[PDB]
Amino acid sequence: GSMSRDPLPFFPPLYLGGPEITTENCEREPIHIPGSIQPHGALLTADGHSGEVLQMSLNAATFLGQEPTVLRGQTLAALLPEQWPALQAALPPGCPDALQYRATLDWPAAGHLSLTVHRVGELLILEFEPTEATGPHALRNAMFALESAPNLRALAEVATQTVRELTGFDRVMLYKFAPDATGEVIAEARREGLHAFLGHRFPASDIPAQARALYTRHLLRLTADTRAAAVPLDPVLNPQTNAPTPLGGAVLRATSPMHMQYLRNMGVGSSLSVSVVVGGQLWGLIACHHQTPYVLPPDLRTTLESLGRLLSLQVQVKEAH
């Protein structure tokens, strides 16, 4: 009912005995601490000073080639001797939780592993994703058509078409929030034949207050496969704190099951969105759908994040005119 209102406090998650989430209580789902990840990658956590590996996703062996039990308790100084110093330097204590370190690692299988790391408090969160063998050059050519737009609607149209051209997604929308937190599709690029959502409005409840809050802090999130089961972290609690591990800054964070059902009800196989944040407030989303499961590659997600940040400034300039 309002973009400026605080979200409600969260319930405990399910693995700490919290309540099942229904349409009556879903604003209280603790979406940032699901204790699990999407299965197209693996996640480890590690102490930010010692590098000791503290938690691992149960599927870690598939991606890393070693079982969860042997890797646990080993240090990153030993495991990643080539990356550990760089990672430390990049993510010092107290850095922003949205700051990332990225590297590409070689692995027995085809392509590489992409490694993305961020810091929350005293914890480092490491995401591993298979990638095949996008420059900053993409973003460069894409800024030109955005800078040439004559007004806010024209900017919206070209930004959505640009994102579609870059990603190949079946649908790319610009969804703009109103002050009552309802939202509206103001531009859409879509594959020929797909039903249009352009000009449609949706209730505030479709993107609940705690999601909107999270999306003001961590600007990109996705569901690669709307039918894929989440993979638990083990142990599920961070041993540093004996409390849940915040996963808001990890793209591999498991998506709310309530939203997964919403996406399936729409016939969506894969979803991704990027926040448009203007003057520190959530202005809208670049919201993308695919008809089938799709893993957008790491570097492309970063181009889209940067683009999201470009678009926010372009909007802020134009709204001031």
Q: Which residues bind ligand LBV (CB under 6 A)?
A: 23, 26, 29, 31, 185, 197, 202, 205-208, 211, 221, 223, 255-256, 258-259, 262, 271-273, 285, 287
Q: At what angle do helices 152-167 and 137-147 cross, to 10 degrees?
A: 160
Q: Which is nearer to ligand LBV, 54 or 304 (CB)?
A: 304
Candidates 94, 135, 179, 193; binder of a copy of itself (CB under 8 A) is: 135
Q: According to CB under 5 A, which one of 39, 48, 248, 308 is a site residue for Cl ion?
A: 248
Q: Which is nearer to a copy of itself, 72 or 309 (CB)?
A: 309
| Of residues 88 and 160, the one with the C-beta less far from ligand LBV | 160
Which strands make up the sheet holding 101-106, listed edge to edge?
A: 36-37, 231-234, 53-57, 42-47, 123-131, 112-120, 101-106
Measured from the CB atom, is 46 or 174 closer to ligand LBV?
174
Residue 92, classified by CB atoms within 10 Å of its CB into exposed (0-12), middle (13-18) or buried (19+), is: exposed
Residues in region 57-116 near a copy of itself by CB under 8 A? 96, 98-100, 102
Distance from C-alpha of 148 to C-alpha of 305, rounded to nearest angstrom: 20
At 68, give phi and psi (nearest 5°).
-55, -35
Q: What is the CA radius of gyration of the chain?
A: 20
Using CB under 8 A, count the residues that bind a copy of itself.
Answer: 28
Interior angle at CA 245, CA 241 and CA 247, nearest 5: 155
Rule CB under 5 A: say whether 244 interacts with Cl ion: no
Give the list of residues 6+ apart from residue 22 with CB closer than 8 angstroms, or none: none
Residue 213 CB contacts under 8 Å (≥ 6 apart), including other chains: 7
Reduced to 3 states (helix: H, G, I; strand: E, B; else coil), residue 182 is: coil
Residue 288, annotated as binding a ligand: no
What does the per-residue mask of binding to a copy of itself show for 272-311, with x meaning CB under 8 A?
---------------------------x--xx-xx--xx-
For Cl ion, the closer CB: 149 or 258: 258
Helices 298-319 and 152-167: crossing angle, nearest 10°? 170
Residues belonging to the binding site for a tetrapyrrole are: 26
Residues within the interface to Cl ion (CB under 5 A): 32, 246, 248
Residues within the interface to a copy of itself (CB under 8 A): 96, 98-100, 102, 134-141, 143-144, 147, 299, 302-303, 305-306, 309-310, 313-314, 316-317, 320
